[PDB]
Amino acid sequence: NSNICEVCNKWGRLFCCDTCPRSFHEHCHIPSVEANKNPWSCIFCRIKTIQERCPESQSGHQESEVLMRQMLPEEQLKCEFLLLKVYCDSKSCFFASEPYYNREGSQGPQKPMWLNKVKTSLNEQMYTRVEGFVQDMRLIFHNHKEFYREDKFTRLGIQVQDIFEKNFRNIFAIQETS
Ligand SMILES: [Zn+2]
Ligand SMILES: [Zn+2]
Ligand SMILES: [Zn+2]
């Protein structure tokens, strides 16, 4: 197994996957690394099994159909994995915890949102469709862009939204377009 967390790239108290060489801090894995379970398989491995069981699941899909899907166990897992892929980028730190807004010439968003809030919402099964999760994720970057206006810090929202969107298209097998 790797000697660093796959998510945050630090050492520490690491749980090792039994079916791949990745390792995780407990609360870096999503869902949090399960209490017992030997063997234990990471989210990466679980996602790969879904694909292997249903190879046609990789054929192109339309985003509008994906968004309307109910949050059955496989969709739940795919959103947890997509959330994790965002935390994998170090720039996710700026969007992880509850923000506050006090900048001359701007007003804070009407509906603040952050990654740990989406993480709790997934854990508490608060989303009934994929659309719920994707709208809260996109809201994080949209709030950032609007608040920071012409400050160059706006770019951090563009950067981490690009990671989200690439991974959304990969995990949900969105039909490739020009
Ligand atoms: Zn970690
Ligand atoms: Zn694994
Ligand atoms: Zn099949």
Round to whole Å and give the CA distance between 80 and 115.
11
Which residues fall within 8 angstroms of residue 52, CB to CB, at 6 or more apart?
none
61-91 per-residue burial string, b: 16 or more CB within 10 A, e: under 16: eeeeebeeeebeeebbbbbbbbbbbbbbbee
98-119 per-residue burial string, b: 16 or more CB within 10 A, e: under 16: ebeeeeeeeeebeeebbbeebb
What residue has token string 């969105």? 174
CA 175 to ligand 2 center in whole angstroms: 27
In terms of DSSP H, where are the helices of 28-123? 43-53, 63-67, 73-87, 93-96, 115-123
Using CA atoms in the order 8, 10, 15, 21, what is the torsion angle rounded to 10 degrees?
A: 80
- Residue 155 has a CB neighbour count (10 Å cut-off) of 13
Closest ligand (CA of 22): 2
Closest ligand (CA of 92): 1
- Resolution value, angstrom units: 1.5
Sequence letter at residue 64: S
CA 172 to ligand 1 center in whole angstroms: 25
Classify residue 177 as exposed, middle or buried by CB count within 10 Å of its CB (0-12, 13-18, 19+).
Answer: exposed
Q: Are 168 and 55 in contact (CB under 8 A)?
A: no
Sequence letter at residue 95: F
Q: Is the dihedral of CA 87, 93, 95, 98 positive or negative?
A: positive
Round to whole Å and give the CA distance between 87 and 163.
10
Q: How was this structure determined?
A: X-ray
What is the residue extent of each domain of the chain?
1-59, 60-178
Architecture of domain 1-59: 2-Layer Sandwich (3.30)
Q: Secondary structure of 105-121 in the HEC alphabet? A: CCCCCCCCCCHHHHHHH
Round to whole Å and give the CA distance between 114 and 94.
9
Round to whole Å and give the CA distance between 82 and 164.
7
60-178, CATH topology level:
Histone Acetyltransferase; Chain A (1.20.920)
Closest ligand (CA of 58): 3
